[PDB]
Amino acid sequence: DYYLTKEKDNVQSVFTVGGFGFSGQGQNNGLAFISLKPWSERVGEENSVTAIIQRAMIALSSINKAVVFPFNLPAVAELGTASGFDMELLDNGNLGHEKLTQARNELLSLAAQSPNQVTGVRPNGLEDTPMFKVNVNAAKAEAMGVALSDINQTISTAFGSSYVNDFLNQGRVKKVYVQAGTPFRMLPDNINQWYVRNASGTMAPLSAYSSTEWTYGSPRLERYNGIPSMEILGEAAAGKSTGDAMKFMADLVAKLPAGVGYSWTGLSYQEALSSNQAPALYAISLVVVFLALAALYESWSIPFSVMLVVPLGVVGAGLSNDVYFQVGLLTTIGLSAKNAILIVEFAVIIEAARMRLRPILMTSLAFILGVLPLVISHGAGSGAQNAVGTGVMGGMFAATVLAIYFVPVF
Amino acid sequence: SDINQTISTAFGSSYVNDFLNQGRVKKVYVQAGTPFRMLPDNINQWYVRN
Amino acid sequence: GADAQTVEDSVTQVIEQNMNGLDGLMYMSSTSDAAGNASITLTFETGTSPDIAQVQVQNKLQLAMPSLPEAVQQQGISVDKSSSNILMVAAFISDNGSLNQYDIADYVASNIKDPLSRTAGVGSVQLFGSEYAMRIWLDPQKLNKYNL
Amino acid sequence: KILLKVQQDGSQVLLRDVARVELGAEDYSTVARYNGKPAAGIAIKLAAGANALDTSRAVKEELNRLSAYFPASLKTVYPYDTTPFIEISIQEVFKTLVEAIILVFLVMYLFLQNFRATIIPTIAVPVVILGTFAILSAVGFTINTLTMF
Amino acid sequence: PDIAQVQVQNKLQLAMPSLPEAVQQQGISVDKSSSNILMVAAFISDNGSLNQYDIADYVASNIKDPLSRTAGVGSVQLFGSEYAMRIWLDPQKLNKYNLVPSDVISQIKVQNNQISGGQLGGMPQAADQQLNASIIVQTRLQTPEEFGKILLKVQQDGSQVLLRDVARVELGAEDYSTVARYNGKPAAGIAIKLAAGA
Amino acid sequence: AVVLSAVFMPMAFMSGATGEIYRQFSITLISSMLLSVFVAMSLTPALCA
Ligand SMILES: CCCCCCCCCCCCO[C@@H]1O[C@H](CO)[C@@H](O[C@H]2O[C@H](CO)[C@@H](O)[C@H](O)[C@H]2O)[C@H](O)[C@H]1O
Ligand SMILES: CCCCCCCCCCCCO[C@@H]1O[C@H](CO)[C@@H](O[C@H]2O[C@H](CO)[C@@H](O)[C@H](O)[C@H]2O)[C@H](O)[C@H]1O
Ligand SMILES: CCCCCCCCCCCCO[C@@H]1O[C@H](CO)[C@@H](O[C@H]2O[C@H](CO)[C@@H](O)[C@H](O)[C@H]2O)[C@H](O)[C@H]1O
């Protein structure tokens, strides 16, 4: 009603499915798909996905008896619905559900004590719920000639919809189910209405030898590699990378009682598998690029001896960089090398660089305006690209003017 | 059938079902005791219901 | 009609204990909810053939098939190379309201599900409904009346 | 009319006498609605290695073909369709490639001031770029952000 | 090897219904196992606090399946057995109470069983109820004294005949056919077979 | 182009997910200079003529 009454001008269809959710299937889970009108009718940024989502957040935070969380589909729906780290708390010590739950609560408390490192840490599983337990006095039932199997089968059939066989309906095979009626399985008092047959053929009610009590139980159990576990989510603090907070959480787990392990899954496992082998591949790539910048201008000849000083600059170089920029720096080094190349090979420079200063800025602008489509729809997203771009272009022009002349004497 | 099942269970450790031990599913076996299946004379100790 | 603990220790652990010896296996996670659903997700190494992995998993599952409870066997166990992404969602409604959700879902599952499911390019389909089933609602008082 | 028990007086005890038999849903755990009206839905998951656009066209054509046998009051609607986004994305990438080559031509023309002299790189570059696309397609390399670097 | 294993496992499924029930329950394994042995890992006890049964059970319960799923490992063989709730019958005591091993097996099957208890207020439910909770009826037995308290028969005077009165229930090895030692001390071992192509 | 093809030649004979990621650069690059050396000696002379 909120979507189709307050914002009819941008929504098209609301498809709500109850009893389903990403956390699993359950009576208390809800999910809704929203369809929007085409971009021709959605004009301006106020009718965009972000603005309507923000308005939905503001309006639906008023739902008192539920937690409604409108959100957009992430960039990669194959890896989850959000970012951060994915963590599994493994109970490899065979401690039990209660001990593991206490350990999880202790870890949450410890993480909340240092918000400067990890933000928004939260469990993923569901909390314990009251559950009904029926205790059957086997000795009492056996004393009056009632089989325990009959009692268990009666209860399971009445409250569990036991499946029997198949039947034909309009040329299709379909199942047959047997269950108690709706008004007979809604309250704890409903058990006292049931009867079972003894060996003599008479009936005795279930209340004669069964006792019921309220207990607690987990509605969802999680396992990892065959070991009981509970998922823990969260995101790194602002200004911090993933590795530092990840290690800090590792130490936090090291502070937990013995018998409790940990492991990373999803994106965190991928980044951990990348990081523990990244130095070796980076070293071999550096060796390969060194051979590349050692084979073209025949050995330490003119510039390749100043590129011999590049490793000192590399070793000189908590702030980090992403995977793409790690290859982007190598490509920048290569394009600077090529900016040198078609003049340095000519020398192998006055006239050569007079007729090759233009290609320097053609290649630079070609790279800039080739990575430009990756980010731009024209007009938007162009103001923030003039900071690095203009400075890099000026630095490259200065390098072309000066370095290919100083390096030969260097 | 009762006689054959009795002999097979007594001397063959018939498997029944599974049970939970320290969070792991493990099998349940039924067999005669050690000092009851060591000699040929041990068969005469067994009884079956009519 | 199974709780989380029951479904876990009766299905999930049994299947997991026989889920070894797989090529390129990365890790394995499983869940067991109170609705009676036991879901096990296996992640394989990048580049592994999905068909080969599915065949291996389905074969190794056959080892644990006789050890599972009879109701689970009758319900059937599905192994699919399903990705988490959803391509598209198709909805079916009634104009005059002549059909409730049960009729629409039954007709869909009986007629439109399996031709769409076997259409080229379709990995798997999920129905937001159920087919018909010859439900028999017992009455405890009447059953006690006739000694049944 | 299934017989269960015959009493001592010869009376029959049928299934309907102790239970209410009706044609009902196999699983009642899921409830779906559309704009508040009762409805049922199908979630179609793309097969691995299959392109989304052609698969969606096939699915839509199958639904249209099956629509001839529908009951008198049944219609089909699409509450969650992603393929128009894919189509508009490719329509935008063609535009972005053509404006990239246009701007390269403009820069080169600003250099030489001779359209006959300036055009040679303008047709030179896109052949290389589309040939590279052809090789990455033939090998089986996807059009991924790493490639678009 | 994968294609051959798949074909063999598929063709075996044809004969699966024709095999005896005990063989089916035991499970049939098809593996691309080579005869060579990569390495053998042994586990011992320092003070002798654990006999071979405890060591083998712990190994099979904790170290077997992570090592078995480790990359490059084709198959593993355990020189031991897990725990198994061994029930040693006594023919004289069974004859004393007029009991047969078949009824003992049936009673174990009944009482050591998990029963799907459903849930209160499940679908479909009334239109005005707010309570929805699972129902727990019976869970699989865990401890040996739990097995020893299984009811078998009630005599005419009301006395109960428990499992412990006719059998000695103890936690024992699943398979006693293998005995392993290390330098004369009790131990259990794992034979690691290299996977093909690794 | 020859030197770049040679230096990128032995990168495609090692495996790994990171290796497969690096293929998305290496293979496109070797194809890039191969196409470049083809086009510079084939296409542009015909045009300028
Ligand atoms: C129908 C064909 C002819 C009609 C023209 C429409 C399509 C052709 C596009 C050019 C017209 C737009 O003119 C505009 O000029 C600027 C400056 O030169 C260029 O765009 C520049 O500024 C915009 C605005 O910040 C940035 O997003 C962009 O990254 C940058 O390259 C584009 O060319 C275009 O955004
Ligand atoms: C006033 C200045 C105007 C300058 C405008 C400059 C560009 C702005 C956007 C225009 C894009 C329209 O471009 C349009 O794209 C569609 C596909 O989507 C193309 O359509 C083509 O592809 C589809 C398949 O995808 C085919 O079924 C169709 O037969 C074919 O012709 C058209 O060839 C083209 O008409
Ligand atoms: C004295 C204490 C020593 C402790 C040292 C701890 C780690 C230090 C760095 C060691 C890294 C060497 O790790 C090495 O990486 C290369 C790849 O680069 C791997 O080589 C592997 O990948 C390449 C492809 O990339 C394949 O062609 C090759 O057949 C394959 O075996 C080796 O499996 C491994 O031998």
SS (H, E, C) D36-105: CEEEEEEEEEECCCCCHHHHHHHHHHHHHHHHHHCCCCEEEEEEEECHHHHHHHHHHHHHHHHHHHHHHH
Nearest atom, ligand 3, residue F13 CA: 27
Distance CA B26, CA E58 (A): 13
Closest CA to B8 of E150, E98, E82, E21: E21
Beta strands in A137-206 (DSSP E): 162-169, 172-180, 195-197, 203-205
What is the SS3 assignment for chain E? Answer: CHHHHHHHHHHHHHHHHHCCHHHHHHCCCCCCCCCCCCEEEEEECCCCCCCHHHHHHHHHHHHHHHHHCCCCEEEEEEECCCEEEEEEECHHHHHHCCCCHHHHHHHHHHHCCCECCCEECCCCCCCCCCCCEEEECECCCCCHHHHHCCEEEECCCCCEEEHHHCEEEEEEECCCCCCCEECCEEEEEEEEEECCCC
> A134 CA to chain B: closest CA distance, Å?
20
Q: Do F3 and A281 touch (CB under 8 A)?
A: no
Distance CA E59, CA E70 (A): 15
Distance CA A306, CA D49 (A): 48
Using a 10 angstrom Cβ sphere, with 0-12 exposed, 13-18 middle and 19 or more buried, the burial of residue A278 is middle
- The continuous run of DSSP H or E covering F20 comes out as helix F17-48
Instruction: Give chain E positions within 8 Å (CB) of A213.
Output: none
Strands E133-136 and A129-136: what pairing?
Answer: parallel
Distance CA E163, CA E149 (A): 6
Tell me how crowded residue A246 is: count the other CB atoms within 10 A of its CB. 19
Nearest atom, ligand 3, residue F19 CA: 25
Instruction: Say if C and E touch: at least 3 Cβ pairs within 8 Å.
Output: yes
Helix axes A278-295, F17-48, angle to 10 degrees: 30
From F11, F13, F14, mutation site for ligand 3 pocket: most ligand atoms within 8 A of C-beta: F14
DSSP A309: S
Using a 10 angstrom Cβ sphere, with 0-12 exposed, 13-18 middle and 19 or more buried, the burial of residue B31 is buried
Closest CA to A272 of C16, F25, C22, C27: C27
Q: Tokens 């159990």 belong to which residue?
A: A221
Nearest atom, ligand 2, residue D87 CA: 18
Please answer whether residues F21 and D146 qualify as being in contact, where contact means their C-beta atoms are separated by less than 8 angstroms: yes
Distance CA A217, CA E119 (A): 13
Q: Residue A86's beta-bridge partner residues?
A: A233
- CA–centroid distance, residue A42 to ligand 2 (Å): 21
Q: Do E138 and A159 touch (CB under 8 A)?
A: no
With b meaning 16 or more CB within 10 Å and e meaning fewer, what string describes E56-76? bbbbbbbbbbeebbeeebbbb
Q: CA-CA distances (angstroms) from residue C37 to B20, C6, C12, C40, E129?
A: 20, 11, 10, 10, 24
SS3 A390: helix
Instruction: Give chain A positions within 8 Å (CB) of E119.
Output: 132, 159
Tell me: cis bond preceding E91? Omega within 30 of 0 counts: no
> F49 CA to chain A: closest CA distance, Å?
22
Give me E115's structure tokens. 């029963």
Question: Going by CA atoms, what residue is nearest to atom 13 of ligand 2?
Answer: D91
Q: Which residue of C has its CA nearest to D77?
A: C91
Q: Tokens 């790994």 belong to which residue?
A: F16
Diameter over CA atoms, chain A = 116
Backbone discontinuities in chain E, residue before each (C to N > 2.5 A): none
Please answer whether residues D122 and D101 qualify as being in contact, where contact means their C-beta atoms are separated by less than 8 angstroms: yes
Q: Which residues line ligand 2 (CB under 6 A)?
A: D 91, 95
Instruction: Give chain F positions within 8 Å (CB) of D149.
Output: 25
Helix axes A267-275, A242-254, angle to 10 degrees: 100
Tell me how crowded residue A187 is: count the other CB atoms within 10 A of its CB. 15
What is the SS3 assignment for A86-101? Answer: EEEEECCCCCCHHHHH
Resolution (A): 3.1
Q: CA-CA distances (angstroms) from residue E196 to A28, A368, C52, E35, E74?
A: 49, 49, 16, 11, 7
Instruction: Give chain C positions within 8 Å (CB) of F17.
Output: 45-47
Distance CA A356, CA A344 (A): 11
Q: Which residues, at least 6 apart from A160, have a Cβ–Cβ distance to it below 8 Å?
A: A179, C1, C2, E116, E117, E118
Q: Do F32 and D127 touch (CB under 8 A)?
A: no
Q: Tokens 């709706």 belong to which residue?
A: A182
The answer to whether residue C35 neighbours chain D at the CB level (below 8 Å) is yes
Nearest atom, ligand 1, residue A377 CA: 27
Using a 10 angstrom Cβ sphere, with 0-12 exposed, 13-18 middle and 19 or more buried, the burial of residue F2 is exposed
From A372, A377, A378, mutation site for ligand 1 pocket: most ligand atoms within 8 A of C-beta: A378
Please answer whether residues A156 and E100 qualify as being in contact, where contact means their C-beta atoms are separated by less than 8 angstroms: no
Q: Do C123 and D45 touch (CB under 8 A)?
A: yes
Please give the distance of CA A209 from its chain centroid, rounded to a whole number.
51
The answer to whether residue E113 neighbours chain B at the CB level (below 8 Å) is yes
Ligand of minimum distance to the alpha carbon of A372: 1
Q: Which residue of C has its CA nearest to F18?
A: C46
DSSP A285: H
Q: Do B18 and C17 touch (CB under 8 A)?
A: no
Single-letter residue type at A264:
W
Q: Which residues line ligand 1 (CB under 6 A)?
A: A 372, 376, 378-379, 382; D 99
Distance CA A332, CA A3 (A): 49
SS3 A164: strand
Question: What experiment produced this structure?
Answer: cryo-EM
Q: Which residues, at least 6 apart from A20, have a Cβ–Cβ distance to it below 8 Å?
A: A29, A30, A31, C128, D30
SS3 A33: strand
